[PDB]
Structure formats: structure tokens, C-alpha cells
Amino acid sequence: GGNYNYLYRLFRKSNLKPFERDISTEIYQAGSTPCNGVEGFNCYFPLQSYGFQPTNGVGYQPYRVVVLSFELLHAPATVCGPKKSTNLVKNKCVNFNF
């Protein structure tokens, strides 16, 4: 029947700055005529909804996305990879790191 809860914005005045976010819901104004908060020609609601349905060809089915962004300000340190450990060989000239 269509999952109409997943919307996207399809009209904006100007492209976003990187990592900028815009949740407003003002009536878009395409033409020169002012809109006064009501719909009509050249006065469009700015949000559309994917109507997802299970019998959609691939490329029409929902994909979930996660974007990891590593940043490095100027602190002293922070999270990082894990650390591997081997075995301790007692009794033998060895090259060690503790």
C-alpha cells in the first residue's frame, strides 16, 4: 500500500552548504508572485514522499545509508582502532614492546 512516511525535500532557494541541515516547511515560491502561505500555481509545498512498495524494481527500493566522518580538530587525542596482543615468551633474548 505504500510507506508514505519517508519524505525528501525537492525545492530550495539555494544548494546546501556541506553538512548543513534544513527542516523548515515554508511554502516554496517558484514564480514571482508572492505566496502568502497558501498553495497554488508556482506556490508549492516543498516536501515529497517516497511511496515505497515491496513490488518495486531494484533502484526503487529503500536503501539505508550511514556516513562516517572522521574529523581532527586540535585536541590531545581521541578514539581509534583497537590493539592486538600476542604471547609472552619467558626465558629467551627477545624483542619486546610493552
Binding site: 505504500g2 525537492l10 525545492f11 517558484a30 514564480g31 500555481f41 508556482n42 508549492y44 515529497q48 511511496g51 512498495q53 513490488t55 518495486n56 524494481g57 531494484v58 533502484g59 526503487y60
Partner: protein, 595 residues
Amino acid sequence: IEEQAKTFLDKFNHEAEDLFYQSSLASWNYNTNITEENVQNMNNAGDKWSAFLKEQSTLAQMYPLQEIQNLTVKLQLQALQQNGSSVLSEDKSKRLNTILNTMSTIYSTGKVCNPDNPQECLLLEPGLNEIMANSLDYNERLWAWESWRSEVGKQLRPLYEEYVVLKNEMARANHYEDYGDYWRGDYEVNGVDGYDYSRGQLIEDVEHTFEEIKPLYEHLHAYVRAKLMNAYPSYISPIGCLPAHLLGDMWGRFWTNLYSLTVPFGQKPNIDVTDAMVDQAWDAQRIFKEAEKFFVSVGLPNMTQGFWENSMLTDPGNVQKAVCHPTAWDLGKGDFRILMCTKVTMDDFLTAHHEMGHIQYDMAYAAQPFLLRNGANEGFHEAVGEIMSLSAATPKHLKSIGLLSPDFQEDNETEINFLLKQALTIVGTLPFTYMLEKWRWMVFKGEIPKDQWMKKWWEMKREIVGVVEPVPHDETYCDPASLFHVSNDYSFIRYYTRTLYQFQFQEALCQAAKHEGPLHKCDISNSTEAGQKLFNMLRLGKSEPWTLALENVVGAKNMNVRPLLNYFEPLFTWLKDQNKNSFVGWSTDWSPYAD
């Protein structure tokens, strides 16, 4: 301003794709599982699509059309701004729909009763089509031909006269001169630097291409006439026209039921691979999987993998009421389904290749906007489907796909049997199609007044087609309206141009696949360069003029009849030797009653 029209169409392109989807998804559930709780499920969901489109149509006239520069956004705007009906008065608009419903139900429910038994009565499709396709009795074919026209066609005569007046009013309010000029608006092309095409230019290109088929059609008409005199002696003149009730069906549209009387060498079996399919235990799925391997052989994509679950390749395991008719569906959102009820036969092995060709055409232009997702004209869509069927019916393809003894010998006697069966369907329908649209074009513009409709109809049968009526018909009959496409408001010139595009595509692809022999032995398997020649047209849609689409495959800007004649030159050479003692041509003075 033009940038407001672009923002108009993108709201259109995302409300339409969803509303067209579920209006076509509900039409799938009715077609594959019939209840009445599905017919009411598709009538309200069908009307939400139609009510939405007239709301956006009346919004489209706020933008002018000549203040636009981009050709693509102009093409989308003109296809949506089209008024069509609704230009009439609101009491004339309901009179036109009453006529179209009355003419459609006369054709489907009209009955003919026997004069020896008035309690037995036949409909057209069960019983009257079987007499015209199977009988060899002269008196029974003459009864079924005349009684369909005198009992059903006489009811359509006062309805078709009122239909011409109301359709010319609707066409002249949309700035055409008549309704025939409205039908020729599909082939019109406006201002794309050298690729233009006028709506009156279609009339000369049909008549210029037709006078090069008349040498080939005259030798086919003379050979069939000489073979019909053995089947009906004392009924056919050796220098005259053919009687209209001895042609294989009700209207003489196809001559394909005359093959058992006109076969050149009846002691050679025409090749039929149906027994080799049931000897290797081929299921329902093998016929499509070998069809998908044909298209991936030429360099075309696989099926979409939603194609295999959602489709219904047979009638179900339930005794399930579901219109069983081969077709290809394009519901939207990249969801392609094929609906057919396939049996293990070489017939449905071939129409599997035909119906997959509609899918591969549909998968290619799916990146265009919504209003340009059709064929480039009305004739391209069926023509791409039938060059897939010609390449799969060759014995060269059948012995490499595993279905023919590697020790098979094709002789020159079986190629004549195959080519003559093709010419009874291809060449035999071309003067019928040309004559019928020429008659309907002259009726709409008024060159034929209504006191000469049936006089000019039968003069054009004797002169162009070479077919004479067995009983004289005055102006109380309407013999064109007894055909389906005339009484159900359909255009008929799409069957003429599709036949010419089909051999232009096939000859252009076989020069790219490096063929060496005759054109009728060709196969485009294992190539890649031919598929690249085909794919460059398939992805255009309606975004380009159709004359620009033809040069991407053929190399010309117009339809041409010389590739059609090169297909039939082995038959045309053999036909001119069988008509050394015959008379080629016909007389328009002889009649089967005029002695």
C-alpha cells in the same frame, strides 16, 4: 517564463509516477485473478488517475507554448496541454460517448441466425470466424459473409454518420482541418534542424512506397488466383478480381488461411519444432530462459530479477479466472511483468521472444521523464518486437540452441514454402491497410459525400486490392464499420508503417552482424556491434524526433520499401516463373453476378 514550466513538470513527474503505479497495479490484480471485488477495485483506482490528469491538463494552459526554447520541456508540455475532447459542448460530449458505446456493443453482441433453423444463432468470434477460416463450401462462405454485413453492418450506418460529424467538430476546435489530420499528428515533427515532417507529408510517403510493392503484389495475386481455381471451379475468372468471401477470413485482411490451398510443395513438411520440446522435458521456465540468453547474447541486460517472482508465466494451479492473453506490462517504478499462459509449442516459443522484446524496449527508455516513455511513434513498438521473432524462427538459430538434428539439410524447396507463408501475412495485408486508411481520410475531409460512401468503397477494392464483391451493396450498408478498428475508434496506419520499419531494422542489423547470404536466413546472435546499433535507438523514447531515431539504426530519415523487397526476392524470382502462362493483373469490370 520558461523556468516556471520546469518547476511545474517536476511536481508533475513525482505525483504522476505514483498515481500511475497503483492505477496499473490494480489493473494487474483484476487481470490475473477475476472477481467483481477486483473490478470495483480497479474502477475507482482507475478514475483517480484520469481525474488527476485533467486537473493538471487545465493547469498547463497557464504556460504559453511558443515562449519555450528547450526542445525536451516543449515536448512534455505539448503532450499534456492537449485538449482532445472537452472542446465540445457538454451535451455533444455525452452524445459522442453514447455512440461509441452503442457501436462497440453491436460489434460484440450482434448475432446471425440460420434461415433453415432460426433458433440457432452465431456470434462473430465463436462460430462465424470459424466458418470463414475453415470452410471450403462456396455457399456457406457466401452466407456468412453477406449476413454479417446485412444484419449488423446496417445497424452501424446511421451511427457512423453521426460519428463523423462529431469527430470533425472536435478536431476543428483543436486547430486541425479534419479528424484524419488529427490522426496524422503522431508523425509530425516541428523544428529540429533538418529532421522535420509534415502531417500532409505522410500521405505522399505512403503512396510513393506503395507503387513499388505493386509489382510484387500483382504476382502474388496472380499465383493465388490460379490456385483458387482448382479449389473453386466455375466460380473464379482467370483475368478478373478475387471474390471477397474466399480469402480466408471475414474481411480479407490476412491471406494466412489460404496456405493449405496455395502451398508450393505439399510433400515437404514446413519445419516444426514442438516434438523436440516435449522430448527433452522443457518446462514453462526453459522457454524464457533461452529467450533471456538470446538477448544477453547480443549485448542487452538481463531480466530485472523481480521479473521471475511477480510474473505469471502460466495459467495458475488454481482453476483461476484470469484473462489469458500474451502481453507486456510496464507498471512503473522499474517493475516489469509479463502476463501470458504459455504452452510447450514453437508458437509460444516465438511469442516469448516477441513479448520479451517489448520488455527490453521498456527497460531502455526508463531514464527519460514520465511523459516521454513511449515509442518514438506508434509504429516502433511492435516493430522492435517482431525482429526478435524473425531471428529466432530461423533454422540456423534452432540448431545452435539445441532443437535440430546437427545433420539437418535445408533444401531450396522448403525456403519457398517458408517465404510464401510469410508473404500471405505480410504482403497480403499491405493493400488492405493502404486502401482502408485512404478511404477513411477522404471521408473525414469530405472528398466522399455520404451518398457515395459504399460506391467509392467498392471501386477502391477492385482497383487497389483486386477484390470484387459477390452481391451489390447500396447506401444502406456500411461495410467498413463491420471491422473492429473502424467501429471501435482506432487508427489503422500504424500497421502499414510497422511492416516497413520491421525490415529496415532487420536489414540494418544484419550488415552489422556481417551476414553473407539472403536476408531471410539472418540471425543476430553472438554479436555485440549489432546490439550497440540497436541500443542507441531503444533508449531515446520520445525525447527525439522519430526521423532522428531512424538514422541511429538505418542511416536514413524516412521509411523505405527496398529492405522489404530484398527479403522477398527469392520468392519474387520463383513467382515470375510460375506466371509465364498466366495473366498478371486484373479487370475491374468482371463480377461474379454479372452474367
